[PDB]
Design an enzyme around this catalytic site. Structure first.
Site, PDB file in Angstrom:
ATOM      1  N   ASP A   1      14.785  -8.309   3.343  1.00 34.30           N
ATOM      2  CA  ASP A   1      14.739  -7.528   2.081  1.00 34.30           C
ATOM      3  C   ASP A   1      15.604  -6.284   2.249  1.00 34.30           C
ATOM      4  O   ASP A   1      15.173  -5.185   1.894  1.00 34.30           O
ATOM      5  CB  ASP A   1      13.279  -7.255   1.664  1.00 34.30           C
ATOM      6  CG  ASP A   1      13.104  -6.825   0.211  1.00 34.30           C
ATOM      7  OD1 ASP A   1      13.942  -7.188  -0.647  1.00 34.30           O
ATOM      8  OD2 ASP A   1      12.146  -6.117  -0.063  1.00 34.30           O
TER       9      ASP A   1
ATOM     10  N   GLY B   1       0.830  -1.226   0.000  1.00 31.44           N
ATOM     11  CA  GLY B   1       0.000   0.000   0.000  1.00 31.44           C
ATOM     12  C   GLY B   1       0.855   1.263   0.000  1.00 31.44           C
ATOM     13  O   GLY B   1       2.072   1.148  -0.205  1.00 31.44           O
ATOM     14  N   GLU B   2       0.266   2.435   0.250  1.00 28.79           N
ATOM     15  CA  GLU B   2       0.985   3.736   0.133  1.00 28.79           C
ATOM     16  C   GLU B   2       1.479   4.234   1.498  1.00 28.79           C
ATOM     17  O   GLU B   2       0.933   3.827   2.539  1.00 28.79           O
ATOM     18  CB  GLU B   2       0.107   4.788  -0.545  1.00 28.79           C
ATOM     19  CG  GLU B   2      -1.012   5.331   0.324  1.00 28.79           C
ATOM     20  CD  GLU B   2      -1.674   6.581  -0.234  1.00 28.79           C
ATOM     21  OE1 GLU B   2      -2.742   6.954   0.292  1.00 28.79           O
ATOM     22  OE2 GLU B   2      -1.121   7.176  -1.190  1.00 28.79           O
TER      23      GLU B   2
END
Ligand SMILES: Cn1c(-c2cccc(F)c2F)c(C#N)c2c(N)ncnc21
Length: 257
Positions: free
Chosen positions: A116, A17-18
């Protein structure tokens, strides 16, 4: 917009999402809001308390959409400080690497792996302090002082350790160490050495054969390149550990005012 906070600017998107800037109309305090499993992410986010990790402030659900309130990094990302084909001045790369290891030692110490690490996920505060961001792939690898091996393949191919393409199960810590090595390469050369660390990747074979007269290795001074020789080791149990990274000659080399 949610509680006293106004969502006044976008900082990043895609992902899950943002991310918005949240200026508090009352106090003018500025924070970041992620607009989105999520239960597990939240639970890891509440554990995080270190100067090189993005602080979690709280969550508010509102029907569909969850809202994750975290420390804002007004300096943007390390990705925007890396000049393509050049990288950055060695002293800035060393300071960012010191801050990245401080953050990774903390996560590993609470038995969390990030999974990550890359420049898009490494953000800067207004004094250029590095913060590890985005715990959407993070997982527990140590609980009640027992390690569990990981089996999910995840991350970003140019940053992933070779054992994660080849083994059913593998230790969490050497995977995060490897991706810190790719980050160090990007900072010093402004280019990634390979698409992925597979034996069918010519650039990876070239590095195992020690052809360091090719790019990106020829842009890198001998001291930091000797550290990259200990980090980008294919066998994860022979790869250098963070305690031993902290004894490395370039790691301890005076460079920066
Ligand atoms: C761009 N950006 C992100 C971000 C991190 C990873 C992926 C992504 F899409 C993002 F927007 C943040 C986080 N977490 C973040 C923050 N806390 N402060 C300021 N800018 C941020």
């Amino acid at each position: 917009f949610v509680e006293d906070w106004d969502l006044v600017q976008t900082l990043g998107e895609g992902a899950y999402g943002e991310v918005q800037l949240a200026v508090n109309r009352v106090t003018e305090e500025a924070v970041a809001v992620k607009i989105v499993n999520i239960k597990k992410e939240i639970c890891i986010l509440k554990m995080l308390n270190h100067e090189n990790v993005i602080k979690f402030y709280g969550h508010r659900r509102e029907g569909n959409i969850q809202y994750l309130f975290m420390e804002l990094a007004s300096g943007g990302s390390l990705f925007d400080r890396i000049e393509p084909d050049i990288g950055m001045p060695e002293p800035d790369a060393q300071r960012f690497f010191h801050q990245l290891m401080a953050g990774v030692v903390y996560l590993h110490g609470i038995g969390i792996t990030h999974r990550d690490i890359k420049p898009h996920n490494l953000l800067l505060d207004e004094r250029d302090n590095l913060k590890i961001a985005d715990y959407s792939l993070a997982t527990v690898f140590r609980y009640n002082n027992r390690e569990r091996l990981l089996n999910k393949m995840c991350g970003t191919l140019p940053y992933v350790a070779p054992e994660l393409l080849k083994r059913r199960e593998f230790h969490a810590e050497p995977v995060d160490v490897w991706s810190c090595g790719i980050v160090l390469t990007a900072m010093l050369a402004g280019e990634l050495p390979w698409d992925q660390p597979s034996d069918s990747c010519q650039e990876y074979s070239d590095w195992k054969e020690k052809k360091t007269y090719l790019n990106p290795w020829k842009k890198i001074d001998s001291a930091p390149l000797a550290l990259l020789h200990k980090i980008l080791v294919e066998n994860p149990s022979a790869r250098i550990t963070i305690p031993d990274i902290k004894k490395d000659r370039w790691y301890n080399k005076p460079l920066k005012k």
